[PDB]
Scaffold this active site. Structure first.
Site, PDB file in Angstrom:
ATOM      1  N   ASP B  73       0.742  -1.111  -0.043  1.00  0.00           N
ATOM      2  CA  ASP B  73       0.374  -0.394  -0.153  1.00  0.00           C
ATOM      3  C   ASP B  73       0.992   1.144  -0.128  1.00  0.00           C
ATOM      4  O   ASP B  73       0.923   2.528  -0.512  1.00  0.00           O
ATOM      5  CB  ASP B  73      -1.024   0.109   1.338  1.00  0.00           C
ATOM      6  CG  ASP B  73      -1.807  -1.010   1.235  1.00  0.00           C
ATOM      7  OD1 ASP B  73      -1.827  -1.462   0.200  1.00  0.00           O
ATOM      8  OD2 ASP B  73      -2.478  -1.575   2.245  1.00  0.00           O
ATOM      9  N   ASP B  89       1.897  -1.992   4.573  1.00  0.00           N
ATOM     10  CA  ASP B  89       0.350  -2.727   4.177  1.00  0.00           C
ATOM     11  C   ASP B  89      -0.088  -2.772   5.225  1.00  0.00           C
ATOM     12  O   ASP B  89      -0.897  -2.497   6.326  1.00  0.00           O
ATOM     13  CB  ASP B  89       0.370  -3.582   3.804  1.00  0.00           C
ATOM     14  CG  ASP B  89       0.268  -4.619   2.717  1.00  0.00           C
ATOM     15  OD1 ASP B  89       0.150  -3.355   1.712  1.00  0.00           O
ATOM     16  OD2 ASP B  89       0.080  -5.556   2.013  1.00  0.00           O
ATOM     17  N   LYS B  91      -3.772  -3.790   7.012  1.00  0.00           N
ATOM     18  CA  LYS B  91      -4.850  -5.619   7.364  1.00  0.00           C
ATOM     19  C   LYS B  91      -5.410  -5.096   7.893  1.00  0.00           C
ATOM     20  O   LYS B  91      -5.917  -4.616   9.374  1.00  0.00           O
ATOM     21  CB  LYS B  91      -3.923  -6.826   7.706  1.00  0.00           C
ATOM     22  CG  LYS B  91      -2.739  -7.411   7.061  1.00  0.00           C
ATOM     23  CD  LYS B  91      -2.735  -7.782   5.001  1.00  0.00           C
ATOM     24  CE  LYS B  91      -1.712  -7.757   4.182  1.00  0.00           C
ATOM     25  NZ  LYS B  91      -1.765  -7.728   2.934  1.00  0.00           N
TER      26      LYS B  91
HETATM   27 CA    CA Z   1      -1.944  -4.042   0.304  1.00  0.00          CA
END
Ligand code: CA
Ligand code: CA
EC number: 3.1.21.4
Lengths: 244, 244
Positions: B73, B89, B91
């Site tokens: 990301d 990232d 989550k």
């Molecule tokens: Ca991702």
DNA sequence: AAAGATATCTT
DNA sequence: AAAGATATCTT
């Protein structure tokens, strides 16, 4: 009817309002992302109130799934007719320019179409209609949307992640194509065509019986399909051979 | 550090603001849905400005994927240290009752971890850290009041589909478990434990090299893992024997 | 195209 | 658990 009133409400709401952010209870606004992942979420939330308003005008209860990997998004049903349920699912895709061909994924070919109660809120044989609400947006060229936050007086400064958005309501069978929409997640592919083709319902299947039979017997890989059928012409030839 | 400042700012923002709807440029507010597909999106967007603010104070550039289907990301880096990139990232997962055990999917085991340029913004070998921003929420059932639109003067009256959002920041390898997080989409599975275990980093791997070697040789199916290893104990035995 | 990536859940 | 569902994209 329910369908004509839903299509008109969706066309109208989309024409009037442009979603541009997520807002907190404190009034602070966070801008949207550029992916389809953020925009398909935003389009689903955008359609909810409309669908509920039109359904209530027609005497239909609206039920959303209780489980997270079930179909459909919205189940409409009159309590006096339990086997006249309507399924409504929202699907989204993008274009880079306004007039290119697009395509959708139309849900699994191996779940509820092969098993009456698999991954579906009510038994599949209780539904008499399966509608897709399809949203198409044109990507903005910028791949660097805003990274700051905003207040309620700056609403018109917030960069929108799309240039234009179009919406249609069509039956699933009518816009269904003959090539998979995904591999490992085995989704039906839609036709590959201009936007007007979905609105107008210019498909390839001759009936919903043919669409269901095609997707119920479609093999998961190329290898297996090469001995059976890969496309509608080969499927009709498979039918002539005696389903062998 | 960048890390300590990042988690203080994420934790603070969570505590002070509560997302409650999508807003249009015209001012109309649409309520939130209760599933992770919606909350995953909202938490990413909520974190974006925070990540950029903290990154900028440490003189780091923030780059987001240019194509869908790519990790991570957020890619952070200094112009002076191009091979010391930091991947971040986001989550998300849910809980039915506050503080039950949780688990996350941590990314594919068959893409960038086995092929340096597969599905990743920059070659995998330019990154020296892979962080996970983990969000956990307790689910709250949608009611009738979520099915209509709201005006800005009713911000505090909008029903939220969640409660008790918690957030952590941890190294991917440290919270990695030994069992797949998904089958057909081959994701790494995290440990299965309470939120404090994630904060404190009580994983099953002894080093990031062991994490990497385990997931680089983990076979896709139980049929194949039967002959190799299925868990950390079996992996350590396999290694002891000479990788056989 | 076909096959497998992107994230997460259910049974 | 493992395996295959939820949507949609790339290549
Ligand atoms: Ca991702
Ligand atoms: Ca759906």
């Amino acid at each position: 009817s329910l369908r004509s009133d839903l299509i008109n409400a969706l066309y109208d709401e989309n024409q009037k309002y442009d979603v541009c952010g997520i807002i907190s209870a404190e009034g602070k606004i966070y801008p949207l992302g550029s992916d389809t992942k953020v925009l398909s979420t935003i389009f689903e939330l955008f359609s909810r109130p409309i669908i509920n308003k039109i359904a209530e005008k027609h005497g239909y209860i609206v039920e959303e799934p209780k489980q997270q990997n079930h179909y459909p998004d919205f189940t409409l049903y009159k309590p006096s007719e339990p086997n006249k349920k309507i399924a409504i699912d929202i699907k989204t895709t993008y274009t880079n320019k306004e007039n290119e061909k697009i395509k959708f994924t139309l849900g699994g070919y191996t779940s509820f179409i092969r098993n009456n109660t698999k991954n579906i809120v009510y038994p599949f044989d209780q539904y008499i209609a399966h509608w897709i609400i399809g949203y198409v947006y044109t990507r903005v060229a910028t791949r660097k949307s805003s990274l700051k936050t905003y207040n309620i007086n700056e609403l018109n400064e917030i960069p929108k992640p799309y240039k234009g958005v179009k919406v249609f309501l069509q039956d699933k069978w009518v816009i269904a194509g003959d090539l998979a929409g995904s591999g490992n997640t085995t989704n039906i592919g839609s036709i590959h065509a201009h936007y007007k083709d979905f609105v107008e319902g210019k498909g390839i299947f001759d009936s919903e019986d043919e669409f269901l039979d095609y997707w119920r017997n479609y093999e998961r890989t190329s290898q297996l399909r090469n001995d059976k059928y890969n496309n509608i012409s080969e499927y009709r030839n498979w039918i002539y051979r005696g389903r062998k």
